[PDB]
Design a protein around this ligand. Structure first.
Ligand code: HEC
Ligand code: HEC
Ligand code: ZN
Ligand code: ZN
Lengths: 136, 136
């Protein structure tokens, strides 16, 4: 019941992006420029199907520097990971929730079996616990 | 001697992003959240390899809205497209330059054969007229 490191996620489908600036309620620790990625499996859910076991969503969080009215991507802060397994991740609505510090497999961030992550993602039960909307 | 609309570019490898805000010298018309994408042939070039004919880079430019210490993606403004053909686009350094308003295939923007585009990109001769760098 550990979430696997999503090897190769940077080659996945880019779902969407958002900037969370200082002062945002989620600034600790979501502050930065973030990009949402989906594997083949997760695309099926985003398109309006059921999320199949093996679907993985990644949220890739970068620091940024405001440089003359450009926001410029700096170092990666972390990745958040949601891993669909209806049986193994049953306690958290069938998604496994993990963080990797600087996107490194060695730096697991989740210490409460993902109940905190699940606490907020539960509001989205009707879209299978997923906030991001697939956009053209 | 026309740049092909890059059908399916939303499914390609996401290279990088940047935000250009009010007050940036490039605000008009490059203002917004932009995402750079690369087809397989473009990735060869970006990796430090050479760009094969048929390499395509896309810059996808979104309007954004302020939303309580968040910049949220709004409407697509346009896409910019560079298509590799050393022979057919030799007047603009082996890349064909085109813009599509709102990313629509029917709203081609470039009127000067891409000389305007090439004029700025020519700064980057030493990285084959590409600004963007592959990051992890
Ligand atoms: C609310 C107080 C949140 C808590 C706690 C967590 N997440 Fe979340 N998450 C939240 C929002 C509003 C979004 C959407 C961002 C966007 O650009 O629209 C997200 C997104 C994710 C994603 C991308 C998939 C999706 O649901 O859109 C992942 C992979 C994700 N979050 C993981 C994650 C983990 C591992 C958490 C605990 C450490 C976690 N989130 C907490 C809101 C909230
Ligand atoms: C300088 C005044 C520019 C002019 C005029 C044009 N472009 Fe450009 N382009 C510019 C920069 C600084 C960047 C990098 C942005 C980043 O996030 O790093 C770009 C990028 C592109 C891309 C992505 C590929 C790359 O070189 O990084 C494409 C596909 C692209 N630009 C196309 C484009 C076209 C079609 C133009 C004429 C309409 C054009 N550019 C003008 C700077 C400048
Ligand atoms: Zn405020
Ligand atoms: Zn500014």
């Amino acid at each position: 019941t550990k979430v696997k490191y999503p090897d190769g996620f940077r080659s996945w489908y880019h779902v969407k992006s958002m900037v969370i600036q200082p002062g945002h309620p989620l600034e600790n620790p979501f502050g930065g420029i973030h990009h949402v990625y989906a594997n083949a499996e997760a695309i099926q859910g985003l398109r309006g199907g059921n999320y199949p076991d093996g679907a993985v969503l990644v949220v890739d969080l970068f620091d940024y520097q405001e440089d003359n009215h450009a926001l410029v991507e700096g170092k990666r802060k972390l990745i958040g990971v949601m891993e669909r397994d209806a049986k193994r991740f049953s306690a958290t609505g069938g998604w496994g929730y993990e963080g990797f510090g600087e996107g490194k497999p060695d730096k697991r961030l989740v210490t409460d079996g993902g109940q905190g992550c699940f606490g907020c993602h539960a509001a989205q039960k009707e879209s299978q616990y997923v906030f991001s909307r697939l956009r053209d």
